[PDB]
């Protein structure tokens, strides 16, 4: 088998290409561009009723006529998975139109012997890396013909590997033909998640979410990683991307020690709805830019 299907189309967002395109085009002509060329961005994988808008901040920054390889780095909710694994097909089909995975750079990635083969089930199974993938088609439709996709499932990395394979993927972020579509949503509050904490301080829940999300969002501007790592251990939000967030960090600051110049900015911040009582609950999204300089 060739090709994995669209296995989120229908529910997830809209299964008709012309209806799915108008949709982005509505939400892409909101954003001013303020960070292009974009070389990562951050960006959503919830449905695109929810955060749609939000994401569209962050694919705006994308450069069609520079960009010609896009990675898209999504955690894994499904599978027990202590690495990263790549597809074992050749398309990625989309609405809009097929995307095609980079031969190239999947051969140089899996010949570093750190990588499994996610199974045909697994890869359809998975929506964290699928809903990037509207997106990146309609932002490149310029350029349909010229463009790559490098798809990486990101497992429960450890620190270490954090750091491995943040240092591997730094080469591939130095070039300006390149992109990293990191995916992850923000605070998943409320019971159903197991995860109340609440800072009342910061006045009503909801804003004690967004206090809780901009500090974890002023620690990737920072572009740390042992800060952002130290976050983590400290509050335990429930950012769904935590891990591709650390590989791209660790692929940051390999290139700070190279003199490259780098700043990340989050343009836009959104959440589900607005919780109020601890029997509601939310989901928060942030989309932002690298840009390298």
Same mark, same amino acid.
């Given at each position: 088998?060739?090709?994995?299907?669209?296995?989120?189309?229908?529910?997830?967002?809209?299964?008709?290409?012309?209806?799915?395109?108008?949709?982005?085009?509505?939400?892409?002509?909101?954003?001013?561009?303020?960070?292009?060329?974009?070389?990562?961005?951050?960006?959503?994988? *919830?449905?695109?009723?929810?955060?749609?808008?939000?994401?569209?901040?962050?694919?705006?920054?994308?450069? !069609?006529?520079?960009?010609?390889?896009?990675?898209?780095?999504? !955690?894994?909710?499904?599978?027990?998975?202590?690495?990263?694994?790549?597809?074992?097909? +050749?398309?990625?089909?989309?609405?809009?139109?097929?995307?095609?995975? +980079?031969?190239?750079?999947?051969?140089?990635?899996?010949?570093?012997?750190?990588?499994?083969?996610?199974?045909?089930?697994? +890869?359809?199974?998975?929506?964290?890396?699928?809903?990037?993938?509207?997106?990146?088609?309609?932002?490149?439709?310029?350029?349909?013909?010229?463009?790559?996709?490098? !798809?990486?499932?990101?497992? *429960?990395?450890?620190?270490?590997?954090?750091?491995?394979?943040?240092?591997?993927?730094?080469?591939?972020?130095?070039?300006?033909?390149?992109?990293?579509?990191?995916?992850?949503?923000?605070?998943?509050?409320?019971?159903?998640?197991?995860?109340?904490?609440?800072?009342?301080?910061?006045?009503?829940?909801?804003?004690?979410?967004?206090?809780?999300?901009?500090?974890?969002?002023?620690?990737?501007?920072?572009?740390? !990683?042992?800060?952002?790592?130290?976050?983590?251990?400290?509050?335990?939000?429930?950012?769904?991307?935590?891990?591709?967030?650390?590989?791209?960090?660790?692929?940051?600051?390999?290139?700070?020690?190279?003199?490259?110049?780098?700043?990340?900015?989050?343009?836009?911040?959104?959440?589900?709805?607005?919780?109020?009582?601890?029997?509601?609950?939310?989901?928060?999204?942030?989309?932002? *830019?690298?840009?390298?300089?």
């Amino acid at each position: 088998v060739v090709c994995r299907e669209a296995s989120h189309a229908g529910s997830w967002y809209t299964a008709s290409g012309p209806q799915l395109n108008a949709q982005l085009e509505g939400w892409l002509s909101q954003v001013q561009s303020t960070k292009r060329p974009a070389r990562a961005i951050i960006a959503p994988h *919830a449905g695109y009723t929810y955060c749609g808008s939000c994401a569209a901040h962050a694919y705006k920054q994308v450069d !069609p006529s520079i960009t010609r390889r896009i990675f898209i780095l999504g !955690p894994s909710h499904h599978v027990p998975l202590s690495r990263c694994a790549l597809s074992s097909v +050749d398309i990625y089909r989309t609405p809009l139109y097929d995307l095609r995975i +980079d031969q190239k750079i999947y051969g140089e990635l899996w010949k570093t012997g750190m990588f499994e083969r996610m199974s045909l089930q697994t +890869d359809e199974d998975e929506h964290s890396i699928e809903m990037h993938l509207p997106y990146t088609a309609k932002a490149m439709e310029s350029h349909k013909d010229e463009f790559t996709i490098i !798809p990486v499932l990101v497992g *429960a990395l450890s620190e270490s590997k954090e750091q491995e394979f943040g240092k591997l993927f730094s080469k591939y972020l130095a070039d300006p033909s390149n992109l990293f579509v990191v995916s992850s949503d923000f605070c998943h509050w409320g019971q159903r998640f197991r995860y109340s904490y609440y800072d009342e301080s910061q006045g009503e829940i909801y804003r004690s979410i967004e206090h809780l999300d901009k500090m974890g969002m002023s620690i990737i501007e920072q572009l740390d !990683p042992v800060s952002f790592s130290n976050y983590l251990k400290k509050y335990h939000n429930t950012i769904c991307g935590r891990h591709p967030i650390g590989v791209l960090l660790n692929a940051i600051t390999e290139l700070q020690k190279n003199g490259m110049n780098m700043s990340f900015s989050f343009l836009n911040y959104a959440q589900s709805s607005q919780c109020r009582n601890w029997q509601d609950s939310s989901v928060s999204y942030a989309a932002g *830019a690298l840009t390298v300089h």
